[PDB]
């Protein structure tokens, strides 16, 4: 009974997708298939710095008058960038649907990058990075990406190295903007109280101008020993299958089974036919090795012996979590934008439920043995990590005798 996500396509290739619902406020966003994976180490912070510059004024709406408009209807304006996708989204009321779309049009095209602003946003970005190091789990996941995807564009961070940040100019940005903002790589996603025909007419009216035009898992480890920190963060991952491979669903159930360290989180990060599947835990130094041992046993267990009931637990757990319908509009659309960018279609919740209920214990331990057993992991540690075991002990813990 969940309403279907209807997708149309303009000549530009900008797929305009929408999923109407009763809620009177909507989350209209633009997703773009452009991240740090498409950068070539000479423009490693171009997407991040453009994400900073995108709300500082356009040609038609110069400066803060633009954001005055998004204050005037009381709407909320957000943007984010990952290694593969960039999103500019607005939460607003339903009746303010046209102007919001027009605002989004300016943000993707006709944007203006002021040289004055460029220096101010450089100091913002530089400073944030200079303090970003504070967030350990971000440092550990960046280290894990770097040591797992050495020599590839997937190792480099979204923010880029301070070097590039300082060394960036309007023209470079202009390039990234004019290169990675093509209309066939763009989805206009709407969730909530929107009509699809009105949204399609608004996309035809504005946004109809947008121009129309592998990775290797290096199993290895990076350890940043700094003994003055109170807690240690350790992430261990193996290679993931990718977006389009259905056993992801089964792997998600495996994560739902795992769900000794103060904090233990499992992740299945997916990129275009690659990814990182693993666990991140933050612990006191004198516990670290025991955690690792614990964690490896669980994984090995699933690969070795997994019952029927726990599987059911994961199935159900995932089900409720996977549930996103009417979770929130922002989430809803976020899902429409990512589904049109990655799968090329919006997978409905009934298909997700079918793929969940076809998962049993035998295929779960088969897929877990395919992806976890006797695999070389990527290890990233930060903090008092002397008792964190080196690569032979972790690699030997990746199988059982």
């Amino acid at each position: 009974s969940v309403p279907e996500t209807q997708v149309s396509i303009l000549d530009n290739g900008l797929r305009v997708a929408s999923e109407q619902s009763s809620h009177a406020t909507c989350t209209v966003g633009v997703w773009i298939d452009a991240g740090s994976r498409y950068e070539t180490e000479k423009n490693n912070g171009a997407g991040y710095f453009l994400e900073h510059l995108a709300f500082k004024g356009t040609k038609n709406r110069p400066g803060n008058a633009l954001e005055k408009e998004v204050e005037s209807i009381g709407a909320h304006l957000n943007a984010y960038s990952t290694r593969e996708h960039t999103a500019y989204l607005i939460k607003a009321l339903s009746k303010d649907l046209p102007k919001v779309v027009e605002l989004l049009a300016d943000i993707v095209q006709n944007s203006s990058l002021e040289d004055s602003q460029i220096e101010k946003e450089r100091d913002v970005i530089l400073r944030e990075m200079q303090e970003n190091d504070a967030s350990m789990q971000n440092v550990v996941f960046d280290y894990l990406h770097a040591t797992a995807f050495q020599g590839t564009p997937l190792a480099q961070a979204v923010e880029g190295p301070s070097e590039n940040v300082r060394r960036l100019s309007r023209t470079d940005l202009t390039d990234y903007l004019n290169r990675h903002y093509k209309a066939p790589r763009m989805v206009l996603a709407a969730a909530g109280g929107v009509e699809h025909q009105q949204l399609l007419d608004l996309a035809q009216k504005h946004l109809s101008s947008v121009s129309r035009v592998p990775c290797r898992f290096t199993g290895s480890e990076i350890r940043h020993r700094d003994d003055a920190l109170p807690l240690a963060h350790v992430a261990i991952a193996v290679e993931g299958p990718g977006w389009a491979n259905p056993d992801n669903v089964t792997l998600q159930v495996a994560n739902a089974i795992i769900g000794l360290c103060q904090s233990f989180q499992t992740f299945n990060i997916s990129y275009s036919d690659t990814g990182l599947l693993g666990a991140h835990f933050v612990c006191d130094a004198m516990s670290i090795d025991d955690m690792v041992f614990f964690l490896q046993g669980q994984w090995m267990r699933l690969c070795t012996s997994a019952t029927e009931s726990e599987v059911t637990r994961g199935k159900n757990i995932l089900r409720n979590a996977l549930v996103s319908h009417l979770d929130g509009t922002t989430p809803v659309c976020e899902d429409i934008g990512r589904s049109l960018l990655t799968y090329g279609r919006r997978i409905p919740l009934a298909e997700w439920e079918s793929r969940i209920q076809e998962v049993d214990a035998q295929m779960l331990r088969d897929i877990c043995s395919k992806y976890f057993y006797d695999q070389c992991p990527a290890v990233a540690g930060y903090g008092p990590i002397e008792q964190l075991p080196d690569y032979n002990r972790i690699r030997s813990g990746m199988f059982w005798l």
Binding site: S220, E221, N392
Partner: protein, 76 residues
Amino acid sequence: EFGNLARIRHVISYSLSPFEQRAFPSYFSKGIPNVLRRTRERILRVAPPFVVVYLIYTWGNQEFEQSKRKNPAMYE
């Protein structure tokens, strides 16, 4: 034990998986140069004592023989 051995800071340490690296990379490529590099730095400290051991050993042997040699003037 591990964890309480020492205090270091800001020393990042990268590494690779064994199966992801060749077994004897550039083994004889640089091994020979290095072994030779090594031998140079230690040969002058090591070798001349054993050289003079060889000279003393030979000397002793020959001297001993001569010692055993019969005096021409002996019993004549």
